[PDB]
Ligand SMILES: COc1cc2nncc(-c3cnc(N4CCC(C(C)(C)O)CC4)c(C)c3)c2cc1OC
Ligand SMILES: COc1cc2nncc(-c3cnc(N4CCC(C(C)(C)O)CC4)c(C)c3)c2cc1OC
Ligand SMILES: COc1cc2nncc(-c3cnc(N4CCC(C(C)(C)O)CC4)c(C)c3)c2cc1OC
Ligand SMILES: [Zn+2]
Ligand SMILES: [Zn+2]
Ligand SMILES: [Zn+2]
């Protein structure tokens with residue numbers, strides 16, 4: 018049979034990639050046509066060679082790719098990079114997650130920014146975009162999930178077709194919650210709640226609502242993982258992130274609204290301080306809390322701390 | 336019937352766009368997939384919901400879009416922007432124009448830069464481009480009109496198929512004259528003639544040759560409308576315009592010909608003075624004459640004057 | 654018949670292009686859709702109007718075009734530019750080459766960088782790219798030839814189908830050797846061998862191994878021809894070349910490896926000196942040796958010397 022042939026197959030990457038893909042700070046490289054193979058490899062090791070029908074999975078991946086746009090940062094590369102961070106979290110916390118959760122989270126990560134234009138929810142609201150009228154909160158993230166479902170509904174694209182309806186509904190809920198959690202506006206309340214539950218000892222991974230929160234934080238951690246790479250990667254990725262911010266800032270000015278300094282290309286000198294503020298208020302607390310809840314995710318925090326030191330070095334002019 | 340269903344339909348934009356589209360200084364935004372809807376809305380309000388068969392119009396628009404190139408300034412965005420300026424002129428001078436003229440001018444504006452490479456007529460002549468051998472004068476503009484006719488001749492693309500042959504020939508003439516008028520080399524003689532006719536009182540909109548001239552000036556005014564937007568839009572658009580000039584300047588240097596300072600990227604410091612010269616010699620007289628002939632177009636002149644003040648502010652280092 | 658109709662046809666370029674295409678320092682221009690016609694013209698003058706079936710040749714050219722990537726320098730424009738330099742060498746040494754060699758070398762030049770990503774062999778090795786595992790030496794060049802053969806094997810794409818098998822095998826060998834010779838790592842040993850054979854008088858164009866070497870040097874000379882154009886072209890092309898180097902340098906840093914100064918975007922100030930070093934160690938000796946072997950290629954050397962003087966002028970701050 019088809020599932021039998023797939024059970025005998027072994028997907029391999031080049032030697033260097035096989036070794037370094039296990040590292041949290043792994044970079045997926047500039048060869049776009051290798052990314053699908055990298056994702057499939059990650060799925061095979063974390064879930065198993067029989068989790069998805071290979072032909073369907075490849076079809077799904079290429080359709081997802083086609084629905085990411087040619088923008089500086091929120092592109093196809095970002096999707097696969099976020100998926101890799103989730104892979105590393107899953108592999109280092111392997112006894113914690115179900116089969117469905119492992120399937121769902123890698124797929125959710127790949128799909129989490131589908132059809133992103135490179136603008137924030139705030140801009141869409143201010144521009145009075147049709148999407149903002151349809152989704153009052155988490156505008157883009159609700160759209161990302163809608164795009165995911167549309168791709169799954171295409172002929173030969175339902176990678177979950179072997180699941181029972183019960184399991185199908187469960188994995189789609191996992192995916193929906195995970196994608197919505199990537200709305201950074203929801204992160205602040207989530208981390209604060211998780212911190213309180215961790216300190217009191219009420220935090221229980223057997224409680225579904227607690228579990229959803231932890232997954233939500235994992236999604237933030239993966240989404241922000243540019244700050245957890247080695248310095249050369251972290252610095253170069255920041256260029257792409259700010260390219261998008263400045264473009265939004267330009268568009269804000271066109272609406273007659275002065276953008277925040279983060280999005281203003283006339284205030285490039287304020288970036289190092291802005292980075293310091295971002296690490297202190299967002300990135301460091303994210304990985305600190307995640308490390309508390311999941312100690313094997315420690316390397317993410319260490320790398321984030323190291324990049325913080327590097328930005329401080331920039332500020333001093335060193 | 337089909338025309339009956341269309342008569343009952345109402346096309347609407349988001350609330351902010353409905354309000355601000357009526358403003359001369361409106362910016363169409365960075366969401367490309369909203370531009371076709373914006374154009375259709377403008378056609379519906381200025382001409383009527385029964386001027387074009389909707390399915391044919393949409394097919395036509397997408398084909399026009401496909402025939403604009405990915406260049407910094409003479410692109411699909413420019414086409415829709417010029418069309419909007421014409422919409423605002425038409426709406427504020429609504430008793431003056433026939434049904435055919437309103438149809439023709441919006442379509443002419445959308446098609447006026449079809450297949451533009453981002454190079455001027457002068458460069459094509461000097462490079463000895465096949466187009467320059469075919470069209471000795473108004474080289475690109477003659478090509479734009481030829482592209483328009485080619486699109487109209489495609490199956491299911493003749494948006495004027497309901498017109499009589501007499502009316503069809505009239506609208507195509509309106510379109511041809513309007514597109515040729517966007518050759519800025521022809522503007523100087525046209526404005527000068529219009530100024531003389533306005534001062535003597537010989538200018539008569541009932542005279543076809545006079546009428547053609549006024550339409551020609553309207554086309555220049557719409558074509559140049561970047562200088563009539565608010566300062567943030569005007570300044571950012573100037574970046575795109577000069578990107579193309581510098582690219583042509585590079586190509587001129589490759590032919591062994593020193594380009595004019597306007598096209599020389601080594602002389603970026605001369606841009607503010609070059610802008611002052613452009614407003615004084617071209618933009619201000621254009622909108623001054625247009626305002627004299629059509630007083631409701633006044634906001635274009637006011638905005639042009641304000642941008643002139645801003646460029647003077649740049650020169651002073653303020 | 655079909656070959657008879659083609660024998661009566663005459664392909665012509667615009668007047669300026671017909672004249673200036675014969676010059677070694679000719680620039681092909683920014684009009685992409687004219688490049689196929691330029692190549693066909695060169696083939697017709699150097700080989701003959703009956704060397705290729707026109708319909709097959711055009712199909713082949715468009716497929717080759719489709720398999721070049723949108724990279725700063727190793728793109729479709731580079732392919733046609735290298736082909737032009739070969740055309741000029743062939744035309745000025747017209748009694749030396751067979752029909753097969755003229756066919757082969759122009760096609761080899763057009764195909765010599767097929768599917769280039771803008772990265773060197775060294776980067777692919779260090780990234781552990783699948784291609785490096787398959788081709789241990791001349792990694793990209795072996796891939797370029799493989800892409801060439803794949804295009805020729807497509808239906809209606811075998812432009813050499815009229816050749817006998819013997820001749821077909823000969824032209825494919827000419828093409829293979831020529832493409833492999835564009836590996837600049839192989840150039841240094843080749844030029845050194847040719848210099849020794851020239852000085853002793855052992856160099857004999859009737860010896861196949863000697864002939865292969867000379868063709869190899871011709872391929873280097875054509876590949877590097879940016880340094881043989883007039884200064885404005887040479888300077889602007891250098892921008893594209895370094896754009897690719899800096900991108901590779903960024904990727905090297907992402908692997909945790911400090912790149913050589915040539916590829917480091919933080920060391921832009923070292924470029925003029927790097928250019929001086931490149932001309933002295935690579936470009937000048939290449940064209941000096943080529944001019945010794947083929948005196949009519951002299952203009953390439955003169956232009957290279959002139960560009961060397963220009964870079965020295967930059968260093969002095971003049
Ligand atoms: C590496 O640096 C960053 C990475 C990042 N990665 N992902 C997301 C962001 C980022 C994206 N947007 C953010 N917002 C959006 C809303 C904006 C307001 C609400 C003021 O419109 C506040 C800032 C914030 C705070 C961060 C982010 C920001 C970064 O620097 C500020
Ligand atoms: C906002 O600034 C401009 C907007 C513009 N929008 N549209 C068109 C132009 C522009 C385009 N080209 C122009 N020409 C072309 C011919 C050129 C010669 C004839 C010397 O080759 C003279 C300048 C001129 C004078 C203006 C134009 C120029 C502008 O600044 C000079
Ligand atoms: C116009 O300037 C150049 C044109 C060029 N055109 N083609 C190729 C190159 C070029 C491409 N790569 C080169 N290498 C690749 C290997 C690299 C090592 C082996 C150190 O990785 C040494 C430099 C070298 C020496 C030259 C080249 C380099 C140039 O400047 C250095
Ligand atoms: Zn997102
Ligand atoms: Zn994201
Ligand atoms: Zn034009």
Ligand SMILES: [Zn+2]
Pocket residue numbers: 413417447448517558
């Ligand atoms: Zn225009």
Ligand SMILES: [Zn+2]
Pocket residue numbers: 765766793835836
């Ligand atoms: Zn090469």
Ligand SMILES: [Zn+2]
Pocket residue numbers: 731735765766835876
């Ligand atoms: Zn090459």
